[PDB]
Amino acid sequence: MGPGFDFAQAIMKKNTVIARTEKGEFTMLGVYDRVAVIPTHASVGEIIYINDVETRVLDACALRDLTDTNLEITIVKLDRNQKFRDIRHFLPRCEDDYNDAVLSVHTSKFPNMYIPVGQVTNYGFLNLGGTPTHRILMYNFPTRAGQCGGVVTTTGKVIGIHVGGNGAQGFAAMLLHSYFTD
């Protein structure tokens, strides 16, 4: 409907797949080559479904900060026959606050879903499902089950993936450029 929604759509139409694990269906962001991200609570194993096709997992790494605290991001390398558009130049270099963000989801339950969430706070620490977690972004939107892995964008930046909510607030794990240096 406006320039925030334009950027978000451009990311969804080329840089997402539907991922299925034994723990559910997730929006999955492809970042470059055969590398994608998903919330760590998806519990990615040796095999994953990508757009309903059986796909071998070449590598999966559940990220933690240097204090050995959960970041809720798992980086997956997929045995896929096609590369993602390289979007690393849209990733922020540092932790930050943002204005006017969009959360975008694409699953069987919620196809082509876009939500204007407004202001995003560098929240920092969150006890997420009982797990101490760092680098959390917060938005004051009543997010619901089925949105995990959703992509959080501003104009020109891909800033996080949705990992949880408390009924009134939603929470995303930051994406940083430094997670995807090669």
- Residue 41 known to be catalytic: yes
Q: What letter does residue 15 receive in the DSSP assignment?
A: H
- Residue 22 known to be catalytic: no
> Of the residues 25, 106, 134, 148, which is catalytic?
148
> Of the residues 25, 41, 106, 162, which is catalytic?
41
Point out which residues pair with 25 in neighbouring strands. Answer: 20
Residue 10 tokens read as 């451009």
Cα 148 to chain centroid distance, Å, stands at: 8
For 89, counting Cβ atoms within 10 Å of its Cβ (0-12 exposed, 13-18 middle, 19+ buried), the class is exposed
| SS3 at position 178 | helix
Cβ partners under 8 Å of residue 52, min gap 6: 18, 20
Across 94-121, b (16+ Cβ under 10 Å) vs e yields eeeebeebbbbbbbeebeebbbebeebe
Please name which of 8, 14, 50 lies closest in space to residue 31, comparing C-alpha atoms: 14
- Residue 177 known to be catalytic: no
CA atoms within 13 A on the CB side of 120: 28
> Of the residues 25, 72, 106, 162, which is catalytic?
72
Catalytic residues: 41, 72, 148
